[model samples]
Structures are given as C-alpha cells and as structure tokens.
Target: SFSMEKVKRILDAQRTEGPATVLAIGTANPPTCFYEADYPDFYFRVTNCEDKPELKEKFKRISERSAVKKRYLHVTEEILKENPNMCSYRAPSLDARHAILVEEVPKLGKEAALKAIKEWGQPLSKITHLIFSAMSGVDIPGADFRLMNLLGLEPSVNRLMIYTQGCYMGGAAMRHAKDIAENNAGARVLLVFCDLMDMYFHAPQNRVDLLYGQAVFGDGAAALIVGADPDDDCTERPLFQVVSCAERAVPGTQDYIKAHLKEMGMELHLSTDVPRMIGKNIEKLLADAVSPFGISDWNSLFYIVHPGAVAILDQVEENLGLGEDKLRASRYVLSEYGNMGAASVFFILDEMRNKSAEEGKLTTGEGLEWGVLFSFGPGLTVETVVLLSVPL
Candidate 1:
C-alpha cells in the first residue's frame, strides 16, 4: 500500500562481515619454452627473416636488453608454417589467427582454473561468479563461453567478460570481485585471465613495432579464487586480503604502450618513454594508496607489480627508492615467463606467496603485513591494490 516504505525496504544492508580474501592462486604456461638467447634465431627463422642481417642484429640487441631469461609460447614451427599469412609481416591474417587463439586460449585458462580450484579443496558448487578476460576475445560467444562449458559450473552462475583490456585487467578483475563478494554474502568468485601472442605473431619485415614485442612477450594464464568471511575451519585458509583497490589513467599517455588491431592482428608499440612516465607519477600513486595506514617508507611494504618490461621495474624502483628485494617476486616472474600481459600479475602474486613459505617468512606476502600491487598497461592505466596478509 505505501509506495515509500516498499521502495526503502529494498535497501537492506547486504554486506559481508569482512573483506574479500584470495583463497588460492594458480598459473600456467605452454610446454614449449626457449632460452632468451635462442629467441632471435627462432623468431627470425619461423618468420623467414633471418636473411635480414641488419634487422637480425638489432633484434638481438633488443633481446639482450629485455632481461628475460626464458619465454613460453603456444605457437610451434608447424603451426606458423601451415599458416603463412599469419607469419607474413604484412598480410591479412586475423581470420586464421583467431581460429588458433579461440581454440587454445580457453584450454590454457581452464588449466589454471583447475589448479586453483583443486588447491581450494572445495567443490565447484560454491563458485557463484566467474570473471574472464583475454587478448583474443573478438568473436561471439567468446572464450568465456567455452571455458564455462569446460568448467561445468552451475547453470545460473553469474558471468562477466572483458576484452581488449591490457595487462592491468588482472587488477580490474580483483576490483570487481571485491564488490561482488562483499555485497552478495556467500559469493565465491573465480577470476581467470590469459594471453596467447599467436594472434599477433608475424615477421618483422620493417614492422618495427613488433620486433620488441617478440623480444619480451610470451604466453601464459593465471587464476585466482576469492571470497569474504572464511569459516575458520581446517579446509579454508585465506592468503591475501584485498583491503582496497584504485585505478587511474595518466593523462595524455594514450600513445605510450598500445596495440592497434588490424586485419593481420595487433600492431604493438612499446614506448621508451614509459619508464620516464611511471617514474614521474608513481610516488604520488603509492603515497595515496598507503598513507591511510600511516606508513611512509616504501621499503616496509612488499610489492607485487606487473613487470611489463625491464624498464617499468627500473623506474618504479628509482621512484620509490625501494629496498633491493622488494621487487624480487616481480622480477623473478618476468625473467621466468616474460610479460604475459593480464596473466603475469597473478603469477607474481603466486611467486611471492610461494617464496614466503619457502624462506619461512612471517606472512603470505613475504612476511610483510602491508603490500601493494601495481599494474601498468596499454591504456597507460595504473591500478593500485592495497593488500593485508594474515599469518597462518
């Protein structure tokens, strides 16, 4: 009868008792890997560009500067040779490449999901939400549709799909999951992201922008399971608490790092100015994220940064004046797997947590109670996620 009471009654305080916690994390990569020193040869060989000694010499220099020791890839010589248009430096090939990506990306993403779900030690019944992101999600009924079928979750499970997002989408997923878990009480969210550069693989052939891409980009996937308010039982152990999250795009930085989609796939551009860009604006971002906790020294809090490239790491350290090992986990993941875009951040998180246990640190975040996760990507976007770690 009363319209006002009926309207106001719908606004109930539906919030969780605690923040979202990362319950489990998992990362996966293709079985094929190549030593960084061996990449210039392999790349030029597959693309039929080994004869260009000038480009070959310069490409070798780029690899040396990448600081990446190894990179896993899903493309094999057979696949590249079978699809010449894909390997042609300037040919219409997106159709062929999309076929390969749509088939493989989901399988890899599913692999990571399986590992995380297994570690959580729970049935898939409680996973109420799924958020999927990818680089080659251009088609209808995207990779998530296939992954959902592969996972076989409940029919009514909520879904969110993100495409064309740069490496920072990992943080974006976490940001969204925080709200979903907190507001929907009993919600268990699954976040999965992957990148397979096969869609963008091509010969240099004066495609200068793609040369550096071959120098550091690789294939990988990562998954994380998150929820709020654990049961405090033997089966549930919360790893890292998602305290707060923030994202900001640096003004006029649209040209810094970008991927221009074309009939042949992506034309990647990695600006040398990115390091300078981050160095200038990074401190303020960090200060604003951590000052609420009354902390000033950057070294005291641990870091889980998506090392987009070696220069990104250098500028961040130079700006924060951080300690030597504050960035070890980030650097370690970069050297081990190269830059896998959205997939790399969760790998860094897993690496940090694993090393903490191995070294007997106090908490999951390398023994630090407070930490920050910084993701820099093609939108020139910067995402800062504040975290709190609990000792088991």
Candidate 2:
C-alpha cells in the first residue's frame, strides 16, 4: 500500500500544475469570395441550373434569410469546369474532389498555422505536438503529414488527425489538446482545423432541404496553440484558460444531421429537426459543465457556439435566457464567413478575443470571468468546454 501511494504521488507531480490554455489563434480563407446577394446567380450558373427559374426564386428567399453577408469558397469556376461531374447529384467524383482537397487543404492550413505561430511569439521549434482536424478524410499520408512538411516543423513532432467530426470536431480538438497538454509538462499542442465543404457541391435538385448547406457552409482554416505553464517573461501570455470539457450525444439524434462519404463524394441530409433536438437538450447536456462550478444564472456566463442558422441561435439565447450581446461573436462570424465546419469554433474564439480587445474590456472574453464554448454536429453530438478568461 505504501509503495502504491508513492507511485501515485509521483505520477501526479509529473503532470502540469496549470490548466491547458489557448495561447494564440488565427484564421484564413481563400480569396474567391462571393457576396450573399450574388451567390444564388453564381451557384445556379455554375451548376447548369440557370434554366430552373422557379428553383432560383426559392434559393433566393433562402439566401435572403440566411443572415450571412459574404462567403469565401475554395471551389471557384475553374475547379467546377475542371471537375464537371462534381456539380451533378450523386455523380462519381470522389477521386477528382479528393485530388483537389489533397493539394489545397494543406496549403490553406499552412497560412493559418503560420499566422498562429507568429502570434505565439515562440520559435517553430517549440511546437511539440500537432492535432489536425478536418471536415472529411483521405487515406494514409493524410493532411497531417502534408501539413507537417508545409509548416516545416521538426520531423519528431507528435501528430494526430481527427476526421468525420463535422463541426463537432472543434470542441473535440480542444478537448484532445487539453489532455495532451496537461499530461505532458512543457508540451505545446497546436491544433489546426480546415473545412472544404465544396466537396459536396451539387446542382439545385428537387431536394431543396439540402440547400441549407449550400447557403450556410463555407471553406476556411483556423489554428490555435494550446499549452500549460506558459512562460510569462517570454511573451507566452495565456488567452483563455480551458477549465474543463464535457461531451454528450443526445439519444436517438443520429438522424438529425446525417452526412455520409461514399463513392459519389459527400452526401449530406441536414434535417429540419436539428434545431428542435438541440434546443431541447441544451440544458441537460450542459449539466455536467455548469453544475461543477455551482453556476445557477445561465446569463452570467458568456458563450461561443457554432453559428448555425439564426433561428437556431435564437433557440439557444431564449433557452438560456441570456443577455442581448451574449452571442455577438457567433452572430458576427456567421454573418461574415457562414459556417466553416470544424474551423468555425476557433474563428469564433478569435473573433471574441479581438472584439474584447477592441472594446478595451477588462479581459479578452468580453470581460467575463467564466464562459462556455459549445459545438454540435453529426450524431447531434454536443460538446462544451468550460473556460476562464485571463485578464489583460
């Protein structure tokens, strides 16, 4: 018993004393941008659906209500012309789409990563771990390996790749980084999330339900540095301390947001039932996250969540009885960039930090002491990371 107790004490002492913290954040988007007003015309023309005037009218109404101003996409006219099969419903274009993603994903990811490294104020040699997440996946030699070479990190860096997470992967990435950082003293965990939703781009078919993705999804990349016990004298200031993380899959919600990767590339069926399912489970799923902190008034906490549809944002705001500006960062990013799948999480966090700094708040998290970052995706898997903002 005495020997076992000594082993346990040694193990505990070996871990980092401080919680994992977000050290820096950065985001990148392709230059091929389209205003929301012109998006419908551009999309219909490119997909050869211009003849469907009635369908164009329907898409126009959807676009007007999307609450998005502009979007940046990797799929421009050139790529569409090159891979004609991708614009058809259920067309066999996996190889063509895969080829485009292989080259572009890592290139864009490196831009975001370099920005993060520059902001980190630490040398590239200090990055000891890489956790890469994406909206989809390929075979071996995935983006993790390609991104490693593109960023020119040391060959011995520990690496991990997470795919098929949809938007839920952002919170999942932070959760993973927390574990990695806390377990290994002095380890700097870098996270990169890139989304190329254009892989599922198709013609305006009778299944208009899928148009939600067309109007809402965009392509972007975000990178964040996570570490514990940062060196304050060396400019390694912590931004948001990750106090805790929790995840739960609401039962029977597997059909709420269904996305499958098949021989035809990507097939997605985002049901209308999603908002209702998520709204109903918001309080229950967050029980573990808030209860531990003795939190009672939901309005006291700030939020950074997936900027889904505007109505969905309303659902969370109303359900929580939050203040008017509690979710401003989510709304603003959704307005500017639409939804970039897994990358949206960090973009929203970076937005929150910038806004607070511009406003000269007492802290980076809108001057809030405690907050929550939420993300949900396929399987309606919901994740929350309890955060404590660091004062400026």
Candidate 3:
C-alpha cells in the first residue's frame, strides 16, 4: 500500500544530493556508567558499587526500594582520548554542584562528534552546518558554539544549538534543516543528537516521575548531514524533503514527561498513562498530518518512529497498525544504541540510510511515495512528519 513514487523520490534526492558526501560523526560516551542493557537483556542491576564492602550495606538498602542501579564514570577515558585539551581538568568543577558530570558537556558535543569524524577519516573543515542537539547540559555560548570553535567549523558558517527539548527534539532538528534547504536550494546542515543518560545516575529520587528514565535511558550521540543540491563531493542523499510536520500537545500536560535540574543531579519523569493517551489520538494526528498532502489510506506510507522504550514502541505500533518492516529502524536502533533521547531518531535514520544504500536505492531512483517520521516526548506529545521524497 505504500507509495513507490514517494520512496523513489527520496532515493533520487539522496542520489543527487549526497553522493560520496561522507559524514564525519563524532560520538562521545560521557565518562559515566553507560549501563543501559541491550534487548533480550533489557535490565541490569547496579552491582558495580557492591564490591565496596563499605558502600555495600548502603547500596543494598537503596537498591531494595526501586530500579536503582549503580552507574559509574565511563566517558572520561573516551573524552581524554578524543581531546587532549579535555585531558587538562579544571581546578573547580565547571559548575560548583555536580561538577564532574557537568564538565563533560564539551566532550559530549564537540569531542564526541570529533571522535566520530576522526573515525570516519574526514577533515573537520569539510563540515557545513554545525547542528548541536542535547538536553543533558547547557552553557551560554552552548555546546555547538564550543564545538564550532573546537571542530573548526567555518568562521562564516552557520551553527544551530537545540537544548532542553526531550526525545522528539531530534526530529524537530531534522525538519528544521530540511526547511533551511528548501529556502537556500543547496545547503548542507549537520545534525547532532547527544544525551548522556548515564550522567544523571542517582538513587531513587522521585518515585513515579523518574522511574522510566532511570531504567530506560542510555548515553550516546549521532551526527548526520542533510545536504541539498549537487556537488562533486556529494554522495547519495536519503529522503531530504519534509512534506508535512504534525505536533500535538496534551491539555495541561506539561509535566507529564519532564526533567528537573537539581543541585545534586537531574531527574526525569514520565507519567504512567502516556502510551494510552498517544494511542487514543494517534490516528487523528496522522490523519491531519497527511491531509495536506491529499492522502487518505493509512497503508500508503511507512513509519519511522522513535522507540521511546520497548513498551512505548509496541503501543504506538499497535495503535497505528504498522507492519514488521515499518519500524525496522526503530527496533534495530533501540537494540543497538538503546534509547538515546533525541539522537535515537538519527540512529534509526542512519540504519535506514545504510539499508536503502545497500539495496541500491541510495543510488537508484526508487523510494516509498509517502513516509512518516514520528517521535513522542515531553508533554506526552507526539511529533509527526509526513514526507514525500523530492526526487533528484
């Protein structure tokens, strides 16, 4: 039922715009216990602190009450390796309270992206737009600003910084870049999604509120560029145009899935009924999202949805009646990267990009005629984008 024309157009666009244009992605795992389990082994009990006989009694007491697991500092080594400047530690923590975790933002935004690019073996200056997206930590000049200076983004080049917004924010970032390209005709926008779920590791602080993230969160980042127009260095593009974007907000639902900053650490809360709330109204939202495109049959499109967690993914899939392949990227990314907050969507997109490429669509003029890009985050809200791949 999916539209081949839309899919083909996406493939064509990728072929024309992104040919051989390699993305230099730098991933920084915050120097903290990155302990979110992969699927099939979806949970881990915090036993790292158990070795400390002195702390064992207190840790056991803490563990008995909730899903609290002890996470440690794992990112420091990666950061130090990525940037020798980061190797030099500041005397007092960047911010007085919770300095260790807070100090790692630069490594996360700039160094992590740098490391990925280094691994990709691309020159830093080759990057076009520097897009920084994260909710973990922030500063005045922001992570992207520091990264622009650190990663050597062109002095006159553009930079965008996204913060505070939760999981769906990455999808918003991609849509933003796509919009920019439509206006400019040929602009390369770099997108970054970084959330260090490990940094906020703490004991059972807020019972119902922080329960979901404490168990489900993970630390990571993903960077990819949405390129417009043609250039010699450009490689194949993957569905670049944004046909429509749908955003729905709950009535008085601001606190449903929210984060709070405290002196000791941060806290994340997810209201228990979010899945049902989304499920109930999903069809209506999708209906409106694709209406402007003059489409009615739901089966005419594929879905690339955020796997907030196993449960949420299942709920959305069932609510929307998606087939197995529809959420392949979501399932695969959730398995491979865990729930990376905003960056999670890009990981899924990356897999789809690779898959389409391997299948020859990256170079071929074939793509689904219509596709839906969706994510759910704070406000128990849903953000959806109905896309028609602009053919090359």
Quantify all predictions' global Cα lDDT against the true fold: 0.86, 0.87, 0.58
**Order the candidates by lDDT, highest first — what do you get?**
2, 1, 3
Model 1 clash number: 0
Greater-lDDT candidate between 1 and 3: 1
TM-score order of candidates, top first? 1, 2, 3
Candidate 2 residue lDDT tens string, 211-279:
877888888999999999988779898999999988888888788887788877888888787877778
Poorly placed runs, candidate 3 (over 4 Å): 1-98, 101-103, 110-128, 205-209, 232-239, 358-367, 389-392
* TM-score for each candidate, following the candidate numbering: 0.96, 0.96, 0.71
Residue-wise lDDT of candidate 3 within 1-392, one digit each (tens)? 27998886775664433222223334545445533332112122231223345443333333333222323233344433343322222222224322443445556666556555554444556566767787766667777876677667788768888776788786677677766554454456667776765334443333544444545566777776555553536443344345656677867778777666654445456787776777777788888888877878776675677877666667777877876566766777666555678877766655665576577662211256677777888886678876554333
Worst 10 residues of 3 by lDDT: 38-47
